[PDB]
Amino acid sequence: MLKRVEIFTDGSCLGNPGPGGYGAILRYRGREKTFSAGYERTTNNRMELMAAIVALEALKEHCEVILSTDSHYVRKGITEWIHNWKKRGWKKADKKPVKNVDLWKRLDAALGQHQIKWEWVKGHAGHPENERCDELARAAAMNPTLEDTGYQVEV
After folding, report:
1. Does the annotation mark 10 as catalytic?
2. In contact, 27 and 133? CB cutoff 8 Å
3. Dihedral of CA 54/77/3/135: which sign?
4. Closest by CA position to 23, among listed 72, 13, 118
5. Of residues 21, 23, 48, 114, which has the active-site annotation?
6. Out of 57, 124, 127, 131, which one is annotated catalytic?
7. How many Cα atoms are found within 13 Å in the side-chain-facing hemisphere of 112?
8. Is 119 assigned a catalytic role?
9. What happens when the gene is disrupted?
């Protein structure tokens, strides 16, 4: 019987772009482990992705994962964009580069190592863990100690 883990994630910035942070909760057999970090300057989208990336990369073995997030960006990417990006060698038809390709590839890599069941949530009511992740991200954004080197501050 495969090990089953529940992952909840959220990420955001205090103004976008701006100081940011992510929050993730990993639950296994009633026990929860928290993950969070704050970055000097980044974007909501990058933090939303970083949250899922870090939680997934925390897994030491192949597991069945129920990943829950209210991120529209992650939802659309997973169910509507990644597929097309991969087939085009990560580059749209307009020849334009894919934004946050560094995190999208890192996430795709982590996802491929487990059996994932995505749960797209829309609202905090009835989703305690998700509100908790949001609170973790906001608190971390207030005291960022990391730098998002992959963030292209350029316009």
Report:
1. yes
2. no
3. positive
4. 13
5. 48
6. 124
7. 7
8. no
9. In a strain that encodes a retron, the msDNA is abnormally sized.
